[PDB]
Design a protein around this ligand. Structure first.
Ligand SMILES: Nc1ncnc2c1ncn2[C@@H]1O[C@@H](CO)[C@@H](OP(=O)(O)S)[C@H]1O
Ligand SMILES: Nc1nc2[nH]cnc2c(=O)[nH]1
Length: 203
């Protein structure tokens, strides 16, 4: 059970996310086997079409744009002042062939609604394809965090240790329409077992 301090620390984590703007994405641009038309029967949640969003610039809702998402696997998100360190890391890894890296689609997961987005007026949940990452990807991410200071992930209770869930987000849907959510998951489940190829760094 969480303590008083832990509960207070969670509020700080959520607010920190809400306050975050202008961060940089350290991720791998990938090619996926699914297309928009595969989800033609699905209704997506796009904050750009919604009202009551209290801060469109917050990274907690800014990227909740239906299925209009560039296919990518996030390694980490950090502050803009780390841009130089990240650029230096890309140069340090210039000899690494990122296109040799591969992920395997395992299971379709609908992440829980982030409290940071909900408090900013969002009503969406992310449907993602959980990926199996090779040791090369895991090592690449660890060394990235060694060269480029990156906020520690805290997706759960503040006391828990983060378990990286490599994933390619497919689309956001309303958190209050189960039929739509389940139909989406079913359709996305058809792509399980597919292999995703890395093209390079997200730019
Ligand atoms: N400059 C940026 N700063 C923070 N996030 C950014 C971003 N550009 C893209 N995103 C995407 O927004 C994330 C949600 O925070 C992730 O999406 P995801 O992997 O699909 S759950 C992330 O990739
Ligand atoms: N990597 C990762 N992202 C998440 N987003 C929401 N929950 C999680 C989680 O457990 N892991």
């Amino acid at each position: 059970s969480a303590t008083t301090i832990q509960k207070e620390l969670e509020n700080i984590v959520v607010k920190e996310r809400q306050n975050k703007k202008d961060t940089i994405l350290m991720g791998l641009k990938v090619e996926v086997p699914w297309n928009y038309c595969d989800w033609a029967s699905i209704s997506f949640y796009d904050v750009r079409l919604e009202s009551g969003i209290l801060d469109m610039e917050s990274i907690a809702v800014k990227y909740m744009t239906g299925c209009d998402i560039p296919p990518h696997v996030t390694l980490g998100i950090t502050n803009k002042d780390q841009e130089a360190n990240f650029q230096r890391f890309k140069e340090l890894t210039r000899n690494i062939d990122l296109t040799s890296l591969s992920f395997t689609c395992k299971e379709v997961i609908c992440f829980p609604q982030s409290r940071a987005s909900k408090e900013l007026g969002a009503n969406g949940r992310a449907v993602v394809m959980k990926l199996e990452a090779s040791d090369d990807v895991k090592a690449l991410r660890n060394v990235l965090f060694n060269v480029v200071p990156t906020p520690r992930d805290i997706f759960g209770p503040v006391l828990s240790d983060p378990v990286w869930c490599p994933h390619v987000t497919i689309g956001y849907v309303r958190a209050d329409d189960e039929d739509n959510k389940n139909s989406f998951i079913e359709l996305a489940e058809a792509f399980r077992g597919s292999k995703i190829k890395v093209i390079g760094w997200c730019e």
